[PDB]
């Protein structure tokens, strides 16, 4: 889509979230494509822990794979990636394995895991990882990609 600068001053990010409201179906996913792309943007700076823990939940409850896929696209998988590392060395048990829930329930191919080296990351949280649910998570999200690794390899 275009876009411009459109400059004003500052916007809550209270007001940034509330304003993705406006992208989901009356059913509470996400129904617009391009929505997604905005919801990613932001994304990138939600430097808040609850506020990234709410973004995972909207792509979580967006059961909808054409929105899931245009999510990776826009690069969204990559900072998924980013988000999980980033929540090993705060420990924070409840975004990691929401992360890992969001990993879950987006379409990946064996590209993915093996250029970011994500199966990699969560291998350490298999073992890892303090909380029972979180380290149970994790094992099934490396089981699950290994035989995506191993279907296609060289």
Same mark, same amino acid.
């Given at each position: 889509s275009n876009a411009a600068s459109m400059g004003s001053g500052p916007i809550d990010p209270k007001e940034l979230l509330k304003?993705? /409201?406006?992208?989901?179906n009356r059913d509470g996913?996400?129904?617009?494509? /391009?929505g997604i792309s905005k919801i990613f943007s932001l994304m990138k700076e939600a430097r808040k822990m609850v506020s990234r823990c709410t973004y995972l939940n909207i792509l979580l409850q967006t059961r909808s794979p054409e929105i899931l896929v245009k999510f990776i696209d826009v690069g969204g998988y990559k900072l998924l990636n980013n988000w999980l590392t980033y929540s090993k060395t705060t420990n924070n048990i409840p975004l990691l394995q929401q992360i890992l829930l969001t990993l879950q329930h987006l379409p990946l191919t064996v590209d993915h895991l093996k250029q970011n080296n994500t199966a990699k990351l969560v291998k350490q949280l298999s073992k890892s990882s303090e909380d029972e649910e979180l380290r149970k998570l994790a094992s099934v999200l490396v089981s699950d990609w290994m035989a995506v690794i191993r279907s296609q390899g060289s």
């Open positions: 304003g993705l /409201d406006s992208f989901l996913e996400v129904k617009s494509v /391009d």
